[PDB]
Amino acid sequence: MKLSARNQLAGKVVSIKEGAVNGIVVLDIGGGNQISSTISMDSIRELGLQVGSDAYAVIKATSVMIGID
Amino acid sequence: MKLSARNQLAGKVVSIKEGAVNGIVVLDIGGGNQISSTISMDSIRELGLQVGSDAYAVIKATSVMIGIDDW
Amino acid sequence: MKLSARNQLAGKVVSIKEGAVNGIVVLDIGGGNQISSTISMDSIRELGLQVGSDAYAVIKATSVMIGID
Amino acid sequence: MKLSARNQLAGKVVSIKEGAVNGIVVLDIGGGNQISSTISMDSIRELGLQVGSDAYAVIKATSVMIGIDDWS
Amino acid sequence: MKLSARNQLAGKVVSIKEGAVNGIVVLDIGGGNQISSTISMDSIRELGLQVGSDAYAVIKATSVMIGID
Amino acid sequence: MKLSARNQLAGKVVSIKEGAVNGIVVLDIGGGNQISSTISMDSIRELGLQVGSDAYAVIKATSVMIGIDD
């Protein structure tokens, strides 16, 4: 599928913390930036995610806030 | 303030597209990646955002999905 | 791509309301159900969406609440 | 109450996956479509949700993305 | 309807700023706190919201972050 | 940090329900109102949140729906 979401950031999975219904996937997207994703364990298994998997952090623009110092 | 949001990615404003109640801020976060953020115009003003401003893309972990090519 | 989101509902576009930076896409997903999606105008154009286009409503499970009468 | 959410889809609960703080409710909304909802276990209890209960999947329009096929 | 959303905060509308597809409703919920809600203009009209309307701010728990000084 | 999020509500932690990857922080914001927050356990530890901590409920405006009595 092709998605409307303005943010689709390629990266490699560096860790997966598993829970009973959800897990937290950490993605290295390069340049020293990491994105953490809290998603269902069902989706983590269905996508075959492992440490080292290539993937994308997918974020709708309306979910992104801006901060300043 | 210190925020629980797992994703707080430093970057520079590349563009601001203004609307009536919301606008879209594009952040260059390095490594060739940019993040687009849809936020209220009042917040864009209150935060003093301009092209070239230093800022952060702030994202709650429960807002991030994962995709794969699945070739 | 293949997306983690638990909800990926095929449907046909029945209306598009254009705004300044966002628009509202309405999808007929069958069974008398329609879904409205508020997304950026850039994504509406980049995806080539028109009335009658085939598309999908994509929703993360953590975005869905449950109600009862 | 009456809710602003543009998406309020009637359906029947077909499964509930219970966890420690959250659970996943799957709603059959007809036409071959199902909606999965991740919500707190306390909410599942307070609403008395069971397999077979009537309910609604409630989704804010700003939470819905659109996809198209890869070959479009 | 009765909603799963853990946050349902009673208040009065103190401001409505209208846009083309969305608007922003500000609700005074007491104690000096106001909650701003960005929702579709259709919902604003359909709920009959005006300055002075009684309403509720409804927020899913997974949408709420915590901050500290 | 200064956040664009239009909703930033001061309160005191009255409870934390811990899970394996997320927890639920209940914040008393006064006037009889509470805010519940489902966030990662890493964040709860990273902010040192405990019962009695002063904190803020932070909500993006696009995350808030409005309801009315019918």
Numbering used by the authors:
A (entry chain F), C (entry chain B), E (entry chain C): 1 to 69
B (entry chain E): 1 to 71
D (entry chain A): 1 to 72
F (entry chain D): 1 to 70
Quote the study's own text.
Additional X-ray crystal structures of rTub occupied with varying amounts of W revealed that tungstate accesses the internal type-2 binding sites through tunnels that are closed after binding. Tungstate simultaneously binds to type-1 and type-2 sites indicating random binding, except for the final binding site located within the trimer center.
Tub has a sub-nanomolar affinity for tungstate and contains a single TOBE domain first characterized in a molybdate storage protein. Tub enables E. limosum to accumulate W and then supplies W for two tungstoenzymes needed for conversion of lactate to SCFAs.
